[PDB]
Amino acid sequence: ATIYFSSPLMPHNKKVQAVAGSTLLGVAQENGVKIPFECQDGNCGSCLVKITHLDGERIKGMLLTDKERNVLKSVGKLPKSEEERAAVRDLPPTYRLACQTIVTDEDLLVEFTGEP
Amino acid sequence: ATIYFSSPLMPHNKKVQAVAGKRSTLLGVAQENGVKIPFECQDGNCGSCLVKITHLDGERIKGMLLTDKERNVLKSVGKLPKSEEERAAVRDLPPTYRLACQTIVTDEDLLVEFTGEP
Numbered sequence: 001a002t003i004y005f006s007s008p009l010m011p012h013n014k015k016v017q018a019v020a021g022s023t024l025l026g027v028a029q030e031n032g033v034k035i036p037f038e039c040q041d042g043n044c045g046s047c048l049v050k051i052t053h054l055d056g057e058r059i060k061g062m063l064l065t066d067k068e069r070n071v072l073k074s075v076g077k078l079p080k081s082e083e084e085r086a087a088v089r090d091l092p093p094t095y096r097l098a099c100q101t102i103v104t105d106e107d108l109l110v111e112f113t114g115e116p
Numbered sequence: 117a118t119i120y121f122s123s124p125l126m127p128h129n130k131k132v133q134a135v136a137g138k139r140s141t142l143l144g145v146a147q148e149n150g151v152k153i154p155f156e157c158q159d160g161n162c163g164s165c166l167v168k169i170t171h172l173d174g175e176r177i178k179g180m181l182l183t184d185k186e187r188n189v190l191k192s193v194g195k196l197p198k199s200e201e202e203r204a205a206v207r208d209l210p211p212t213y214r215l216a217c218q219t220i221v222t223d224e225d226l227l228v229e230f231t232g233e234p
């Protein structure tokens with residue numbers, strides 16, 4: 001698993017190869033990436049990260065082509081929420097708490113403001 | 117993968133053992149096992165093979181691994197969109213509507229429902 005860490009407080013992004021252990025925060029701290037860690041109960045929100053999934057499904061769980069979405073819409077089997085979710089122009093980022101995020105086999109771009 | 121086919125036109129559901137393949141479709145599995153899902157086009161544009169799929173194993177809400185606590189913390193900092201909140205707050209296992217001729221059989225166990233109407 002390849003993780004690219006990025007922050008306005010880092011002049012260079014950091015490419016990290018991660019192995020089984022494990023949280024995003026744990027991986028970051030182990031590799032000198034200073035994601036703010038301000039609680040031991042996962043309630044403060046200081047470790048907030050913006051994650052872009054680099055490989056795998058573009059929209060997680062949404063394997064539908066434009067054609068299938070149109071066919072499903074025509075029979076009233078495509079909810080507006082699912083339509084809008086798939087119609088996103090730019091690769092959708094997910095906000096997570098790094099102290100709660102388990103490192104999987106997925107390649108990620110991990111962004112954080114650097115502010116406490 | 118285990119697939120359970122169910123329809124108002126079938127007095128009994130049909131449990132099927134299928135093999136995951138990049139070219140293997142839900143409709144192909146159904147036809148091979150005598151499950152009469154309507155098949156009316158070769159282009160995936162007619163909508164006859166419409167199925168309601170319940171993912172029996174794996175992630176409850178595909179791509180959402182967030183705990184209730186994390187969802188609450190993210191909401192408090194305005195980093196949980198209303199659409200993602202409602203999607204995770206669903207009380208019943210969320211069913212997905214698909215065209216069986218377009219659905220690729222993976223390792224995931226499924227409940228596959230269809231009306232039986234052409």
Ligand code: FES
Nearest residue numbers: 039044045047099
């Ligand atoms: S360090 Fe407090 S929520 Fe992650």
Ligand code: FES
Nearest residue numbers: 157162163165217
């Ligand atoms: S058979 Fe026509 S959409 Fe599947």
